[PDB]
Amino acid sequence: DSIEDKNARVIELIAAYRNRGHLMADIDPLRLDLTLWDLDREFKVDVQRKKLRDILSVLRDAYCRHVGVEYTHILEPEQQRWIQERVETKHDKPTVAEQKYILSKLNAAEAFETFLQTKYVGQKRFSLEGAETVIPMMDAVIDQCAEHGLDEVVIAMPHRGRLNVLANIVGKPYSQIFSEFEGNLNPSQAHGSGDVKYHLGATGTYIQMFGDNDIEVSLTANPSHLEAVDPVLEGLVRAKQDLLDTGEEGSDNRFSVVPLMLHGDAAFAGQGVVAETLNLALLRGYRTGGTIHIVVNNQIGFTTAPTDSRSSEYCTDVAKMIGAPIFHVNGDDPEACAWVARLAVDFRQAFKKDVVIDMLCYRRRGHNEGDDPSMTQPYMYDVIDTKRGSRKAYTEALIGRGDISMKEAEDALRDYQGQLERVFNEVRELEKHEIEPSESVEADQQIPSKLATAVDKAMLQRIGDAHLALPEGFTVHPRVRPVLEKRREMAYEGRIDWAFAELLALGSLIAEGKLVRLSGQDTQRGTFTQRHAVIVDRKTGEEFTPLQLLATNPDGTPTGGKFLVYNSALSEFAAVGFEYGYSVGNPDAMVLWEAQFGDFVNGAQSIIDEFISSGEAKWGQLSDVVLLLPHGHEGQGPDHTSGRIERFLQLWAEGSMTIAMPSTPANYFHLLRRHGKDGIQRPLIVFTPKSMLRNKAAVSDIRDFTESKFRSVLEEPMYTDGEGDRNKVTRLLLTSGKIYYELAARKAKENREDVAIVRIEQLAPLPRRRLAETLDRYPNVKEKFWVQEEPANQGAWPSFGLTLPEILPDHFTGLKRISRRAMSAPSSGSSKVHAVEQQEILDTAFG
Amino acid sequence: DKNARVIELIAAYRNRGHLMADIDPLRLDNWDLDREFKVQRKKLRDILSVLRDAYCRHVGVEYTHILEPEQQRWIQERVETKHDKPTVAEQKYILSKLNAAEAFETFLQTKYVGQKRFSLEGAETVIPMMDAVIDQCAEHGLDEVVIAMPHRGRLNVLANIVGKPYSQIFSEFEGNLNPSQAHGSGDVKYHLGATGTYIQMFGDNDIEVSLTANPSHLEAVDPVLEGLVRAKQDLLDTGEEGSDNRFSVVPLMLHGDAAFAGQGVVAETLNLALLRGYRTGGTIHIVVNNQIGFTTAPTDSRSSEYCTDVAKMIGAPIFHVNGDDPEACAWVARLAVDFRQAFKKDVVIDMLCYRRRGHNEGDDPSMTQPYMYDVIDTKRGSRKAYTEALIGRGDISMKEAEDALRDYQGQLERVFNEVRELEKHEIEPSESVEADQQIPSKLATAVDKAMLQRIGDAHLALPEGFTVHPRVRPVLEKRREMAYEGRIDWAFAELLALGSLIAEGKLVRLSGQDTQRGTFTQRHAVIVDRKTGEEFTPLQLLATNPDGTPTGGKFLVYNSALSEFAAVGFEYGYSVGNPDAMVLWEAQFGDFVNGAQSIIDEFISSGEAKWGQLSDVVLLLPHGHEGQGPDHTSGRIERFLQLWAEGSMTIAMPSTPANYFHLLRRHGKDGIQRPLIVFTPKSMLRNKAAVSDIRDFTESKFRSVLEEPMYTDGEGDRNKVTRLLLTSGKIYYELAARKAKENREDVAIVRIEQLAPLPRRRLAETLDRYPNVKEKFWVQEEPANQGAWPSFGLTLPEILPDHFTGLKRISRRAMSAPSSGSSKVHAVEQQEILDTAFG
Ligand SMILES: CC(=O)SCCNC(=O)CCNC(=O)[C@H](O)C(C)(C)COP(=O)(O)OP(=O)(O)OC[C@H]1O[C@@H](n2cnc3c(N)ncnc32)[C@H](O)[C@@H]1OP(=O)(O)O
Ligand SMILES: CC(=O)SCCNC(=O)CCNC(=O)[C@H](O)C(C)(C)COP(=O)(O)OP(=O)(O)OC[C@H]1O[C@@H](n2cnc3c(N)ncnc32)[C@H](O)[C@@H]1OP(=O)(O)O
Numbered sequence A: 001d002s003i004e005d006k007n008a009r010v011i012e013l014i015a016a017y018r019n020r021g022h023l024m025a026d027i028d029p030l031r032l033d034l035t036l037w038d039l040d041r042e043f044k045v046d047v048q049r050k051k052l053r054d055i056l057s058v059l060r061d062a063y064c065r066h067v068g069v070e071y072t073h074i075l076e077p078e079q080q081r082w083i084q085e086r087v088e089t090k091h092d093k094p095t096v097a098e099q100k101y102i103l104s105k106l107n108a109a110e111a112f113e114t115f116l117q118t119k120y121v122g123q124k125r126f127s128l129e130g131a132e133t134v135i136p137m138m139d140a141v142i143d144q145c146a147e148h149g150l151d152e153v154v155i156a157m158p159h160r161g162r163l164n165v166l167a168n169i170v171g172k173p174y175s176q177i178f179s180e181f182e183g184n185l186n187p188s189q190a191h192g193s194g195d196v197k198y199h200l201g202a203t204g205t206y207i208q209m210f211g212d213n214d215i216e217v218s219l220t221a222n223p224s225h226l227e228a229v230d231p232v233l234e235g236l237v238r239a240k241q242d243l244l245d246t247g248e249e250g251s252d253n254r255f256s257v258v259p260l261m262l263h264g265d266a267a268f269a270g271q272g273v274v275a276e277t278l279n280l281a282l283l284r285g286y287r288t289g290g291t292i293h294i295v296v297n298n299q300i301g302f303t304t305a306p307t308d309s310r311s312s313e314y315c316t317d318v319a320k321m322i323g324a325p326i327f328h329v330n331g332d333d334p335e336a337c338a339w340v341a342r343l344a345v346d347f348r349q350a351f352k353k354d355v356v357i358d359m360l361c362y363r364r365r366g367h368n369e370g371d372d373p374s375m376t377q378p379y380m381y382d383v384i385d386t387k388r389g390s391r392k393a394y395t396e397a398l399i400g401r402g403d404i405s406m407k408e409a410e411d412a413l414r415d416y417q418g419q420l421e422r423v424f425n426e427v428r429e430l431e432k433h434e435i436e437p438s439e440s441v442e443a444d445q446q447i448p449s450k451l452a453t454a455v456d457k458a459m460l461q462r463i464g465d466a467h468l469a470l471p472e473g474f475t476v477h478p479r480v481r482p483v484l485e486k487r488r489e490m491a492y493e494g495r496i497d498w499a500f501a502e503l504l505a506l507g508s509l510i511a512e513g514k515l516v517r518l519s520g521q522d523t524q525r526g527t528f529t530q531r532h533a534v535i536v537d538r539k540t541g542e543e544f545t546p547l548q549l550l551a552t553n554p555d556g557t558p559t560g561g562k563f564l565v566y567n568s569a570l571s572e573f574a575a576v577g578f579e580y581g582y583s584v585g586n587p588d589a590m591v592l593w594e595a596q597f598g599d600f601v602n603g604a605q606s607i608i609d610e611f612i613s614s615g616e617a618k619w620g621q622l623s624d625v626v627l628l629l630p631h632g633h634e635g636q637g638p639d640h641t642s643g644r645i646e647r648f649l650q651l652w653a654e655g656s657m658t659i660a661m662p663s664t665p666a667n668y669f670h671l672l673r674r675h676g677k678d679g680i681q682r683p684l685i686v687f688t689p690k691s692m693l694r695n696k697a698a699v700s701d702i703r704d705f706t707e708s709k710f711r712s713v714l715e716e717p718m719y720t721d722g723e724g725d726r727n728k729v730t731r732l733l734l735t736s737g738k739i740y741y742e743l744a745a746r747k748a749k750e751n752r753e754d755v756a757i758v759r760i761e762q763l764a765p766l767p768r769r770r771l772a773e774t775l776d777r778y779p780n781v782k783e784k785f786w787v788q789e790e791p792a793n794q795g796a797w798p799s800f801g802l803t804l805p806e807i808l809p810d811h812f813t814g815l816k817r818i819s820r821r822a823m824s825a826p827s828s829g830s831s832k833v834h835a836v837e838q839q840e841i842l843d844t845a846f847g
Numbered sequence B: 001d002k003n004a005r006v007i008e009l010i011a012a013y014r015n016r017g018h019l020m021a022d023i024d025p026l027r028l029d030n031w032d033l034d035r036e037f038k039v040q041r042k043k044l045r046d047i048l049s050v051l052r053d054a055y056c057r058h059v060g061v062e063y064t065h066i067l068e069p070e071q072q073r074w075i076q077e078r079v080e081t082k083h084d085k086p087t088v089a090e091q092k093y094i095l096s097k098l099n100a101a102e103a104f105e106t107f108l109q110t111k112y113v114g115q116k117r118f119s120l121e122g123a124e125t126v127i128p129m130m131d132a133v134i135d136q137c138a139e140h141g142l143d144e145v146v147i148a149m150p151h152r153g154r155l156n157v158l159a160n161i162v163g164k165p166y167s168q169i170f171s172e173f174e175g176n177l178n179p180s181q182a183h184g185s186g187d188v189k190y191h192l193g194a195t196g197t198y199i200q201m202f203g204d205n206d207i208e209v210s211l212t213a214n215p216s217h218l219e220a221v222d223p224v225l226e227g228l229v230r231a232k233q234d235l236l237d238t239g240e241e242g243s244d245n246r247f248s249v250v251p252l253m254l255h256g257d258a259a260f261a262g263q264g265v266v267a268e269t270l271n272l273a274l275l276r277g278y279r280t281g282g283t284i285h286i287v288v289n290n291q292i293g294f295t296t297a298p299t300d301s302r303s304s305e306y307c308t309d310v311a312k313m314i315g316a317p318i319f320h321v322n323g324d325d326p327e328a329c330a331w332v333a334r335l336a337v338d339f340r341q342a343f344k345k346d347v348v349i350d351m352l353c354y355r356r357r358g359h360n361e362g363d364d365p366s367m368t369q370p371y372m373y374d375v376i377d378t379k380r381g382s383r384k385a386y387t388e389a390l391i392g393r394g395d396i397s398m399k400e401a402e403d404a405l406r407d408y409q410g411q412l413e414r415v416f417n418e419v420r421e422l423e424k425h426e427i428e429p430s431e432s433v434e435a436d437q438q439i440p441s442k443l444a445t446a447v448d449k450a451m452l453q454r455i456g457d458a459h460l461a462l463p464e465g466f467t468v469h470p471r472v473r474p475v476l477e478k479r480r481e482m483a484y485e486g487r488i489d490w491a492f493a494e495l496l497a498l499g500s501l502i503a504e505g506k507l508v509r510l511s512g513q514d515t516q517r518g519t520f521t522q523r524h525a526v527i528v529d530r531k532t533g534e535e536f537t538p539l540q541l542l543a544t545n546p547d548g549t550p551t552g553g554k555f556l557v558y559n560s561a562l563s564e565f566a567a568v569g570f571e572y573g574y575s576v577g578n579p580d581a582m583v584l585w586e587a588q589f590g591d592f593v594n595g596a597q598s599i600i601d602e603f604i605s606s607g608e609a610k611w612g613q614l615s616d617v618v619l620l621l622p623h624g625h626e627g628q629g630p631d632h633t634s635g636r637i638e639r640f641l642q643l644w645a646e647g648s649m650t651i652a653m654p655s656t657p658a659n660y661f662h663l664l665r666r667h668g669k670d671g672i673q674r675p676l677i678v679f680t681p682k683s684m685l686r687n688k689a690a691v692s693d694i695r696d697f698t699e700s701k702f703r704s705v706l707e708e709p710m711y712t713d714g715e716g717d718r719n720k721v722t723r724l725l726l727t728s729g730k731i732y733y734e735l736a737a738r739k740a741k742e743n744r745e746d747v748a749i750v751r752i753e754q755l756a757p758l759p760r761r762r763l764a765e766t767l768d769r770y771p772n773v774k775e776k777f778w779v780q781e782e783p784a785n786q787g788a789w790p791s792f793g794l795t796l797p798e799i800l801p802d803h804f805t806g807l808k809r810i811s812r813r814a815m816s817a818p819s820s821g822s823s824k825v826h827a828v829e830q831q832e833i834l835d836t837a838f839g
């Protein structure tokens, strides 16, 4: 009513457009879903005086045209002001040369799809038709990154316009893409079992069209499993940033390697790994200084409408949890798409935070190029039939503006189409090779000859002394202090436990110049209070990392090594994905991921199945990620007992991974040191102990570290070092893990000279030669038994019971099993029932 | 202008006031007032006092992210108004809950100091808060509250909220279990569930309270709870598939702060909240935010301000409440239920508290968090502070409070003594649960020809003016023809099985990614009008008898979200919630079921042995080597076979449509409340040889072992057979076509349709019909380390030594991936198998 009362209604209106203007924005290319006298009156705006008509025009233009902005949810006021200053101001129109360049990208995007439709009508390619604006948008992201002088852009994306992105953004040769469609692959392309064309990656150098800077562009490989690559990309980028000494663990806060993550609208809302990966964005051990997210929102998921794909307004609403700004942009406006892309990069650079671009578009054809979409979405495809497409609509705009002519536009398309045909002809002209079955990739990585993993006594002692080389005035917790003192004593006197042997292995590698990354749930202290990789000051809370002292030589010079130890988030899928990604990103790093209990690794099953166990065969992607899985039957229940050995053994083929269950601390030390020094970029699966960590018998001597190597097959010390007679042995018990000690204690108690226990430390690849050689030392053996704690359908028996009598018939024909009955669950819920079952196994083994 | 600054200030408190609220009980991180303004006309001092009281005291309110204006106004009206204090009787009742909560934890600390119980100490306010949720649900006249929660205060919740007898809880600590408690392999005490009846203290209403079982896997039970509640809602005819939109079954989901932010299944389950096939009319979420995750600080557990920030994606209101204020906690709990009832939407309560002891009762927390535990040691505890507050108010005396605690402590000791007095039973190893569910004798699954014809006729019984898509119409017409003339394909036999069950009165729930039409355009369970977009479900016509009476059955078919973990979890929960329902979940390709590994491992394969929880969930997994790549080839048969033990599940790979029909009808009629794993076909859906006759549906039953038709119906001689090829799946047709082409009378192909439990007797009986067999081979498309060979190669020579000693394998080499990436390489490998099998 009054001038003071009207001014309050203006501030409400300013806020309404800033908070809810995006709900009115003309973002959908398909289009499916105070008095008038006060307009010329001046009002106070945060302070300057502006007319209502000018305030309203700025608000409508910024928030209700082809760009929908979601940013008021952000808690940082400086971020809200930064977005406000760049969206609520008239941004200069692009140059004729820049416009022509955008059209050239839309031309290369559309013609690439139509060419494939004409030549390979029967083959699926997951076309970007109806979403061609992704190409000039990604180009603008990469160009803006190059303008900031960044080092690399790493891309992860699904199937949608993948071939297009590889050819028009990354720079993968058209000849290579057409050869995959032709089915005529050379020995390098036909190597391994392989994977489909829209899962493959590439690398290249992006050169600025209107700038002088250049930037590396990489696209990583991925399975069909939508969004599974999300933490893998993050891990890959983090490893690269750590090598470049940029980012969280670097000197320069540049975060010069940029993750560019693409997504589909149904997969972004539906896959849990998306929230798991976004939750890593600002963590100390996982941050990459912000990811640029592009959602190719074609408002469909195969035959599923968005109404059945999510419970939220936008497919991007999950990204609001990390305070990420969200930009919904109309896919029919390539200039707004290129502008939002450059704004996104600028925001990422200013606040080192994630930015999400929701590109509203459509899918011109069916889900695949063979699917009929009118069966399930007739109304949408009746609307698509009327739409002209971004390329033709943008061409008509540029001719209308007077930038180009109809002839210039037509000659440009014919030049690109001509170039494709010329390359297609040469691929067809290549002589067709004989199609042969896929071959095992086992021989691709050769075991090095005579590799030494032993360390000198001085090394053990230095790692020991490092545990007591505390900073001035540091107050050690009274229950942590005996561990540090016992470790220095262990390093000089012997009887080294499992927890110290692990740190002796990692510390000696750091001293040799290796980067060690160790992470997992409560991994800094350890689930079983054994590691103490990081010790906390009882009074101040200051952290001390003893192994970090080994990154410096005694003269003061750096070794080149580093110890990166973190407590992970309560995730398995994202954390395992990230560590796999890290190991691929930096192959010279020692990357270890620890499960709280091995029973939780099934939460990251997609990473194990789709990346860790099959990545080499499928894409030639090498990873040496170490998985530490606490395993053992101790009466703690079915979810605190098994790391599912049987599952990893089942997945094993073509010498893809090393699967071990060491029984001694020294053997574990040699296993870890071999993995970090052998140069075999293949994963390592370690079934680690819980109660065995504190077993007084499960200790090792200094000579085991300084004079021995890894031993895949272990005999009882009485036959190798003692006065035991191998000829008295009639019964042979073959085992793996902590049950050896329980069997050895029973053998000692009853003085059973007729029984020998042989341990298999390396489960896969099977040490066939060493195992045969070891059994040949017991000539009077009449019966052999595989003994294990695990149920009959679990542990090593499902694979060993079948492979051992086949690979060694003269040694294992008639091999019987001693174990728990076949069980649905990994063990019993009661510790008392476990104890009875355990005694039954020992009684049977000595019956 | 002054009035404009007031509007910005009003907005500042409503949007960001929660950042200033005194919600943390530990406190770790550190002239115009009399003028009137237009809001009605109110003084700035009165506006400011209302804003500070509503948004900056012990309750932090996040709601301005909500897009519905009516929801924002509803919260504003209940939050920005002076709320009446609870009555002396209500206050005394809240203290009685805090007394029960703390004394239960101190009693277990004193009696079983060495056993881990995951104490709720420092978070005792969860008990009066949950009581207020349940009491408010009972006040709304709701039928049931189903709870899912982790380990934190689980024993406490079972004893003080659900009503699990203390005698039972203490017998679990003593390790003295009777035959019913010791049945199966079992699970730890803080994973078990219970049921009971909640009776209002100051009301006359009663409500069912249930707590569901769960594994250690934090948050995995979230979609399971949703599915369980949804099945109960559908039975009560309340909700989305009901006459009334009451949603009378309430999901009460509890969480830990580190698990809520870190587990992806949380976002997957929240994404289901408003979907047609998954919505439960809103979940009440309680986060026990003790600002710790074992030894991990919140700074390393999440990238967001609040552990609850993920729930803002479905526009859920979030209430951060101080755990030291039990009255604010009880008020927020009742506000949450009221919001859920008004808008049938999810509500999140973030109870800020602390963990008095270590992660477990044996863990020393000062090793990793010395500052936090130096602060906790100075804190008095919600029970003692609340006791002192009521003494100060004059509600109770020091004597009345002490006498109340003595009564609860005295009752606990009395019960503990009786459990100790019980005779200790001999501890024996766990036993298989196989015999618990017996196969029924002579169960008929065949239907009359008229039923096949009715399901056929239903595909063409289109509504008036309905326009069928030109490529969908031949499927409907071919189906009516198939129903009367025979040559029934796979896709129609499935709908014949489901349709006949609906006609018999069974509730059929079928869901999965693009399941309504089918990934391979074969199902067409829902047909869309080409002109209007109107949907028509042919099988729904079978829920009505020809006289017009309902059969009692219903067809619930949905397109799922792009999830595996939550969708499989939900369907498992649904099958447990309604055991009389036919619940089927279909994977796009079986290669994506590993995204639900935790549900398969922790619920489907081991739920019966661990908790006595029975599920008859059906997993449909499209499987087969066709050259579509390593992620469009295998459902990982070897993994399901590995998990199989104690007759927990049925694992099948049928080769004929008729067999699949009988497998599905047997599952829905046999009464065995155990899951079914079906490896379903892709190209075999359109194979002209993979068809069945009417007689196989009307006069036959499921056949676990199948012979070639030439021996059972044709003119083939079994005695001429010298080589025997044992197989499963679509490769049979490729082997049969090779046998026919080369006229190999010396070779016979025997199919194993049911992989687990192994049909040992039928398999032996079938092989005894080929007496001149000199060599036997297991033939499969799958790599040597995959398919049925890893288990069959070991079990078959052991269970049947006179038949399978020296059984050799014919398959693809052992592979890291389920198959090759090239279709050309697949074709060469496939021909190599056929060539070896007939070499
Ligand atoms: C990660 C992988 O799986 S790549 C494995 C390579 N595979 C092949 O070469 C195919 C043939 N395979 C084989 O011969 C066996 O499975 C092998 C590799 C275990 C060797 O059999 P064995 O000789 O009986 O076991 P053994 O422990 O004595 O191996 C002997 C040597 O190979 C090394 N070695 C064995 N397995 C591995 C492994 N998984 N990673 C690294 N080095 C290994 C040992 O350290 C040892 O080196 P050394 O002779 O200087 O002491
Ligand atoms: C889901 C489960 O695992 S409950 C399994 C019960 N387990 C046991 O009884 C342990 C002993 N096991 C066995 O006898 C075998 O493993 C069985 C159950 C497969 C039967 O072996 P066979 O007789 O050789 O195969 P067959 O298919 O002819 O089974 C015969 C009968 O049992 C029924 N049957 C077999 N398996 C199942 C099953 N998984 N679910 C329901 N019914 C079944 C058959 O339909 C048939 O019924 P019918 O007598 O009316 O014709």
Ligand SMILES: CC1=C(CCOP(=O)(O)OP(=O)(O)O)S/C(=C(/O)CCC(=O)O)N1Cc1cnc(C)nc1N
Binding pocket: A159, A160, A198, A223, A224, A225, A226, A263, A264, A265, A266, A267, A268, A296, A298, A300, A301, A302, A363, A367, B513, B562, B564, B588, B592, B595, B631
């Ligand atoms: C469900 C599914 C698809 C629906 C796609 O939904 P969107 O995310 O909206 O993507 P588009 O619209 O297709 O660009 S594609 C798809 C494919 O097989 C990808 C083609 C490939 O790469 O081989 N799957 C199957 C699928 C289901 N579940 C999971 C976890 N991953 C999947 N890939």
Ligand SMILES: CC1=C(CCOP(=O)(O)OP(=O)(O)O)S/C(=C(/O)CCC(=O)O)N1Cc1cnc(C)nc1N
Binding pocket: A521, A570, A572, A596, A600, A603, A639, B151, B152, B215, B216, B217, B218, B255, B256, B257, B258, B259, B260, B288, B290, B292, B293, B294, B355, B359
């Ligand atoms: C990581 C982990 C825990 C940390 C708990 O974090 P929060 O969510 O904040 O809970 P609390 O503070 O303990 O109430 S408890 C826990 C337990 O073993 C639960 C005790 C049990 O039920 O046996 N695990 C291990 C764990 C790791 N990953 C997954 C998916 N689930 C887990 N349970």
Ligand SMILES: [Mg+2]
Binding pocket: A264, A265, A266, A296, A297, A298, A299, A300, A301, A302
């Ligand atoms: Mg889509």
Ligand SMILES: [Mg+2]
Binding pocket: B256, B257, B258, B288, B289, B290, B291, B292, B293, B294
């Ligand atoms: Mg916690």
